[PDB]
Structures are given as C-alpha cells and as structure tokens.
C-alpha cells in the first residue's frame, strides 16, 4: 500500500509538473496540434518552440540567425510562460540545423518536443491514468489502514 | 523588406523542391533502365535454355 | 497564415514526387512488359527453329 500510494504521488507530482511550460513543453490539452509535429514533418509544414527574451522583436531577431533556409516565416512568440517568450513557431525539419540555429544564437534556449495527435492524446492519457491512481491508491491505503 | 525577403526565401525553399522532383524523375529514369535491362537479360536466358 | 508559401511549395514537391513515383511504376510495369515481349519472341524464334528442326 505505501510503495502504491508512492508511486501514485510520484505521477501525480509529474503530472503538475510537466503543465507548468515555463522553460519545457507545456501541457498537451493546452497545447496546439497543427504545425507542432502534428504533420509538420519534412517538408509537408514547419514546427519550432524557444524562448527569445519576452518580445516578437528578439524571437525575429533569434529566427533572422535560421539564415531562412527552411520555414522562413518569423518566428511569433506569446504566451503566458514566465510572462516571456513561449512560442509555437515554423521550422522545418529539412533545416533541423537551421531550426537549432534560429533558436541558439540567440540563447533562446528551445524547448520544442513531439506534440502529434497521437502524442497529445498519450499525454492527455497518462494525465488522467496519473489522477485516477492518485485517487485509487488513497483509496486502497484507507481501506487497507482500517483493515 | 523583409516578408519581400521572406518571399524570396519561399521561392528559393520552392527551388529545393524543384531540385528534388529533378532527383526523383533521374532515379526514376535509372530504374527504368535498369529494370528493363535486367528483364531482358534474365528472362532470355531461361527461354534460351528452353528454345536451345 | 504565414505558412501559405511554404504549405504551396510543400504540396509542389509532394504532386511532382508523387508523379515520378507513379512513372517510376509504370516504368516497372513496361519493363515487366519487355521481358514478356522477349520471352514471346523467344518463343517465336524457338518455334523457327522447330520448323528449321524439322528441316533437319
């Protein structure tokens, strides 16, 4: 009972944690599909996350150093992340160089990741099987305390 | 002007892909070749041993 | 929408790799054509010499 309820503590702990998307990839439900490895593969569409100082301003002047050799629409960043840079951003994984480079001269310091519909979904998944075994596991230690 | 810029990017972006139908259409090119040499050549052989 | 160039020139490439690949297999399938005209004029040539045969 204790190694179940620390482990459910454990997921729920990361399930909090993973939402922040302060400096990591914030949560799937929040997140949007399109253009964020939801296709967006090769050259079919782009998808780029960093986070350059807190204006448009810096994350064009972090996406001019891409040398636009792939997706070279500017880089658009706004969210609510550490009240600075959060961005959903096209960066072609045909210039995945590029993509690093629009990001790293900068000191944007990218936190892009996998976000696909079945990623999201997975995500959305282990969130509630985390919140579901929380509740479980409190469950079972109480009845296993009065036992 | 720089979206001007960014047009000019697009296109040169649209150029890569220019370049990459170009590769497709000599590979397939080659395997054409390629296929109907081998067909050719292989199937003769067993239909000359049996014509021999 | 900033996108709208690079989604036309994505859905160039894909229309002309598309293209190429179905050449490609028509090219197969005319190359597999090929053999079976040379395998048919073998066997015509195979039955010349059935009459040449039989002229020996």
């Given at each position: 009972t204790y190694a179940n309820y620390n482990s459910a503590k454990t997921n729920l702990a990361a399930a909090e944690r993973k939402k922040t998307?302060?400096?990591s990839?914030?949560s799937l439900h929040?997140?949007?599909?399109?253009?964020?490895?939801?296709?967006?593969?090769?050259?079919?569409?782009?998808?780029?996350?960093?986070?350059?100082?807190?204006?448009?301003?810096?994350?064009?002047?972090?996406?001019?150093?891409?040398?636009?050799?792939?997706?070279?629409?500017?880089?658009?960043?706004?969210?609510?992340?550490?009240?600075?840079?959060?961005?959903?951003?096209?960066?072609?994984?045909?210039?995945?160089?590029?993509?690093?480079?629009?990001?790293?001269?900068?000191?944007?310091?990218?936190?892009?990741?996998?976000?696909?519909?079945?990623?999201?979904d997975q995500l959305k998944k282990e969130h509630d099987s985390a919140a579901s075994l929380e509740q479980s596991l409190r469950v079972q230690l109480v009845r296993l305390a009065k036992t | 002007?720089?979206?001007?810029?960014?047009?000019?990017?697009?296109?040169?972006?649209?150029?890569?892909?220019?370049?990459?139908?170009?590769?497709?259409?000599?590979?397939?090119?080659?395997?054409?070749?390629?296929?109907?040499?081998?067909?050719?050549?292989?199937?003769?052989?067993?239909?000359?041993?049996?014509?021999? | 929408?900033?996108?709208?160039?690079?989604?036309?020139?994505?859905?160039?490439?894909?229309?002309?790799?598309?293209?190429?690949?179905?050449?490609?297999?028509?090219?197969?399938?005319?190359?597999?054509?090929?053999?079976?005209?040379?395998?048919?004029?073998?066997?015509?040539?195979?039955?010349?010499?059935?009459?040449?045969?039989?002229?020996?």
């Amino acid at each position: 009972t204790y190694a179940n309820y620390n482990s459910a503590k454990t997921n729920l702990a990361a399930a909090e944690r993973k939402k922040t998307g302060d400096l990591s990839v914030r949560s799937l439900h929040d997140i949007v599909k399109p253009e964020d490895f939801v296709l967006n593969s090769e050259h079919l569409t782009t998808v780029l996350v960093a986070v350059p100082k807190s204006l448009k301003s810096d994350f064009e002047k972090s996406y001019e150093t891409l040398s636009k050799n792939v997706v070279p629409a500017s880089a658009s960043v706004i969210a609510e992340d550490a009240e600075y840079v959060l961005f959903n951003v096209h960066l072609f994984k045909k210039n995945v160089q590029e993509f690093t480079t629009a990001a790293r001269e900068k000191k944007f310091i990218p936190r892009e990741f996998n976000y696909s519909e079945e990623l999201i979904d997975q995500l959305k998944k282990e969130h509630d099987s985390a919140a579901s075994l929380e509740q479980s596991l409190r469950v079972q230690l109480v009845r296993l305390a009065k036992t | 002007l720089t979206p001007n810029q960014v047009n000019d990017e697009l296109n040169k972006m649209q150029a890569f892909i220019r370049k990459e139908a170009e590769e497709k259409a000599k590979e397939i090119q080659l395997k054409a070749d390629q296929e109907y040499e081998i067909e050719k050549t292989n199937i003769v052989r067993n239909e000359t041993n049996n014509i021999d | 929408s900033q996108k709208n160039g690079i989604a036309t020139l994505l859905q160039a490439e894909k229309e002309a790799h598309e293209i190429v690949s179905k050449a490609r297999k028509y090219r197969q399938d005319k190359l597999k054509q090929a053999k079976t005209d040379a395998a048919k004029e073998i066997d015509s040539y195979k039955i010349q010499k059935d009459k040449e045969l039989k002229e020996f």
